[PDB]
A paper describes a structure:
Bromodomains (BRDs) are protein interaction modules that specifically recognize ε-N-lysine acetylation motifs, a key event in the reading process of epigenetic marks. The 61 BRDs in the human genome cluster into eight families based on structure/sequence similarity. Despite large sequence variations, all BRD modules share a conserved fold that comprises a left-handed bundle of four α helices (αZ, αA, αB, αC), linked by loop regions of variable length (ZA and BC loops), which line the Kac binding site and determine binding specificity. The four helices form a deep cavity that is extended by the two loop regions (ZA and BC loops), creating a largely hydrophobic Kac binding pocket.
Author numbering: 620 to 734
Amino acid sequence: SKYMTPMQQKLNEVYEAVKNYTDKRGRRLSAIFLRLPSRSELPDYYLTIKKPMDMEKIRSHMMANKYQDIDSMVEDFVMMFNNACTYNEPESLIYKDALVLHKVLLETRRDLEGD
Ligand SMILES: [Cl-]
């Protein structure tokens, strides 16, 4: 029950790498990516963004064993970061953090390449 398969562990490690990333100043960038606002808190968002995505949705999908490989998980993270960069202006913190976390994501995948 509690022992993950290698693929489950890899998925978890990728997810945790993005979640736990702290920069050189101690700032945990993922805090604002965990959960989107509701449709009634920010309707404009859901009019603008075709496929809403946040880390909780990612985590839920992973916990359900719905990701069959790492690339499928990466695709959802990419969607999330691209949505943040579509809704928000390039000057904004959310846009900038999405770029940093995208780099964390890809470096992590590359680092785990051989497992
Ligand atoms: Cl980095």
